[PDB]
Amino acid sequence: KPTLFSAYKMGKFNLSHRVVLAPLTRCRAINAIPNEALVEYYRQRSTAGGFLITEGTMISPSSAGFPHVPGIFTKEQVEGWKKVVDAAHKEGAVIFCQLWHVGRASHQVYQPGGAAPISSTSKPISKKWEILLPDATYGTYPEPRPLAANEILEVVEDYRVAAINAIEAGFDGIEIHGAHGYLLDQFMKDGINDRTDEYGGSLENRCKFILQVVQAVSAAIGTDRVGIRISPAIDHTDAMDSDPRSLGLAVIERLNKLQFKLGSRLAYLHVTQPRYTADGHGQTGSEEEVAQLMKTWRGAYVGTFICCGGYTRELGLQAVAQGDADLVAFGRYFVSNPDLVLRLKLNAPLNRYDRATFYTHDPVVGYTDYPSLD
Ligand SMILES: Cc1cc2nc3c(=O)[nH]c(=O)nc-3n(C[C@H](O)[C@H](O)[C@H](O)COP(=O)(O)O)c2cc1C
């Protein structure tokens, strides 16, 4: 019977337990090159048959919206990732690279030639939100430039190339970052997408871009090496949809149809959910609604389902035991608990995490120096 600590066949891959390292931007990849700090970071968190998803990784120079995040669009970057991947594999881990384009959630200082960030729209993120700049101050999100149709196809090509480069680096697969108000979410969410062309309006039009990406990377490296992450009900950086339930089901129906058409299943669907507790962990109304949404989306998707967002040991156990999810990803707890899988198995205390060093750049401090049990 399925439990949080029981084995799982994720299509092509075999896992020994259901605890997953959620993708986490940490900003230690100085000048976008994966390095020895990242090697130790992922090695520390690796387990035999444990699934790891990397931090968001740039698919292009226009992809960036944080400092010192890794890319996978140059040979030098690929060579850096090889070292990370080899170390993870030496521990028996399965590791996917998350492909990340931030869209309008960026700033001129992050853009080639100081160009405007690109998006579905010309509308900027509101002043209620601010962006961390490379000089450790916070700045204003600028007006983005809306992509023309041919430019969207160029971004699809960037994802395709990024996927091929990931496989060259030895990654087991990739995850399409389609969540949290970044580029693809800027097209899906009717709170952001005000386009009047073939990429705006209907759910069909709004889902077109992300489906083109899924189709392209599946063609390049195989459906069974492709995972997709979405967050229809998370509002981060003004990324709301008027009907998250329908948006989620629209994406899922299209994934199901693509799988049926091509004759194989994607590696997984990965959905993050909002929480309504003070600290954003665990459970307290909106809670019950969100919980049912997640069960509805799980039930509608044909294949492996990863849940994420505020899961605890008890909630992770329940999720797998009751069939609500096949795999459970952990973000913040994995920051401060390199041996999180062991700690969960032993019901050991979890180290507190320090948010002040989430996005600083030191290879050791607040990055690789959280203690393991051993
Ligand atoms: C510091 C930090 C960095 C994150 N970076 C990413 C990222 O690069 N890509 C992504 O999809 N989610 C990212 N997330 C969201 C997490 O994957 C996760 O969904 C979120 O933290 C909620 O899960 P949790 O309660 O286990 O932390 C990040 C979260 C935090 C706190």
Ligand SMILES: O=Cc1ccc(O)cc1
């Ligand atoms: O979902 C992507 C993401 C990236 C950086 C963050 O800090 C949080 C989320």
